[PDB]
Design an enzyme around this catalytic site. Structure first.
Site: not given
Ligand SMILES: Nc1nc2c(ncn2CCC(CO)CO)c(=O)[nH]1
Ligand SMILES: Nc1nc2c(ncn2CCC(CO)CO)c(=O)[nH]1
Lengths: 308, 306
Positions: A11-12, A15, A17-18, A34, A52, A111-112, A165, A169, A171, A174
């Site tokens: 999921g996004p 949220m 999940k970890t 992860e 990013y 994780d994913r 959320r 803060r 990653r 990010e």
């Molecule tokens: N594979 C991929 N993962 C992405 C991208 N952007 C954020 N993430 C997840 C990275 C952190 C959240 O932003 C979680 O580890 C992207 O473009 N590709």
């Protein structure tokens, strides 16, 4: 034989999940965390900060779609690396499904899932325009064959609460791109419907021209993202090449057992809530009897070396 | 079910596969090079891009980083048709039917997923335009080897190859003799690798020598002694070591046959029909498998072959 129940939490990002899975694991069970160290060091160097920034440079109009596309596309290849290898070596030891009675011999929490790197994130970046739909389908064609007992827990969280959320803060590297949060939200919604639609028997080939519970309108599944002038021939139909990939996306997702855990609560509620779903999740036998151990040492090695 | 015989005419480019393969066809279908896909459909003139970038790198106008980045993406695009094909084909493949002939259909493919998922990527790596970590990303993505996998690799001495590679070569190419030395070394190694894996060799058990079968330094594993893959104490991180586990289970089950390309056309085309004798056949999974399989090879053909 000793059964094994696998569960992938996806999921996004942002949220919670970890945490939940830790709380869940803190209670037979091993956790495949992860692989940040890969993303940060082992595989590249600040892969996530790279993502990013480029998209950012793209939004500033300092880098052109192609420079960010080529930079993004390749930044994705690094992200999915650990997921893909884990599956590859895991696959063999996975045998036939058994059935959701308690308990299994082992429980691997992930994780994913491969699809998150080979589909969701890219499609998302595609809507974000930092990536093409051709490349997106390229990954889709590489998504490994779906393993039996592949349980996917996607996650629900209200927007304001999700934005809220991320705001606090997340990653390292990010940047809060709400639009990205939006895309990535959209893509994980679609993914849910897509599985449903598919399980209910949808056949995008028939519903192309149209471009639990009831069957969703194909226009509400992932497909819809693939009705683009890049992917269409002068006579309007998709080029067989892409159509054929939509055909693999369909096969891949078609056997997945997707569940929606709610994240609009306390970490503990999420733990308890996610635990009450793990019970209706399909498990499988292992291939070698002594697979549980290797599968175990495998997860512990991944963690010890890629966790962070 | 009826049987099928799939042949993947592989090896380094600029040798004559393409030339020799069409000849056989003019029971047997031919799935050509997805040139329209590399030039138009997937992206624009990809090849000219692969070669330019390598050029700019060589001509110090760009950085290994910048090369690597573009070089990585392009490969994604070059291997696309192979994967989707392999993935749309997969289910129609039944088990190895003894060697059981005559097959109801012979499919001739112009290259295997490995050319784009292993071989070339290994080559560009050796060129400074692509990361070893990246190369292992695709190695893992290598799809499970289906039964009845027969690969024909070609032998042609450097000089003659240089000569053929120069006959004329693809929209956008630039004679890069090193890329010829890189590519010949790779397939050459891969040839040894398959024999290594079949004579019982274990890379974990041999890995320390780099510091009846061929020496491990004469296999594709020796390439992955890339310091970047190694831990501060020289060790190899488990991710890559796993990627390599994959690479091994993948190749070991392949049937590779050598075609001497140093002999005028038809002479090679002939040898291509002769090899067919030991290639493994497979049964198809469903009644309507062969027909579905025919259309795939014909529709890929008209759309991507140029
Ligand atoms: N594979 C991929 N993962 C992405 C991208 N952007 C954020 N993430 C997840 C990275 C952190 C959240 O932003 C979680 O580890 C992207 O473009 N590709
Ligand atoms: N996948 C890949 N293929 C490459 C690369 N460079 C040359 N080729 C050659 C392809 C030839 C097929 O004979 C020319 O059509 C490369 O970097 N990646």
């Amino acid at each position: 034989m000793p059964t094994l129940l696998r569960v992938y939490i996806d999921g996004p990002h942002g949220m919670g999940k970890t945490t939940t899975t830790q709380l869940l694991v803190a209670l037979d069970i091993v956790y495949v965390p992860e692989p940040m160290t890969y993303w940060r060091v082992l595989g590249a160097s600040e892969t996530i900060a790279n993502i990013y920034t480029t998209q950012h440079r793209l939004d500033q109009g300092e880098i052109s779609a192609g420079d960010a596309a080529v930079v993004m596309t390749s930044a994705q290849i690094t992200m999915g690396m650990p997921y893909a290898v884990t599956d590859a070596v895991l696959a063999p030891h996975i045998g036939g499904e058994a059935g959701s009675a308690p308990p299994p011999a082992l429980t691997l929490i992930f994780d994913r899932h491969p699809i998150a790197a080979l589909l969701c994130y890219p499609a998302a970046r595609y809507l974000m325009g930092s990536m093409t739909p051709q490349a997106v389908l390229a990954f889709v064609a590489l998504i490994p064959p779906t393993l039996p007992g592949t349980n996917i827990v996607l996650g629900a969280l209200p927007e304001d609460r999700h934005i809220d959320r991320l705001a606090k803060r997340q990653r390292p590297g990010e940047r809060l791109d709400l639009a990205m949060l939006a895309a990535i939200r959209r893509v994980y919604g679609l993914l849910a419907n897509t599985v449903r639609y598919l399980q209910c028997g949808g056949s995008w080939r028939e519903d192309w021209g149209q471009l639990a519970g009831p069957r969703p309108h194909i226009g509400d599944t992932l497909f819809t993202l693939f009705r683009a002038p890049e992917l269409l021939a002068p006579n309007g139909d998709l080029y067989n090449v892409f159509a054929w990939a939509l055909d693999v996306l369909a096969k891949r997702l078609r056997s997945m057992h997707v569940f929606i855990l709610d994240y609009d609560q306390s970490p503990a509620g999420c733990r308890d809530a996610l635990l009450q779903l793990t019970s209706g999740m399909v498990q499988t036998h292992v291939t070698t009897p002594g697979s549980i151990p290797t599968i175990c040492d495998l997860a512990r090695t991944f963690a010890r070396e890629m966790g962070e």
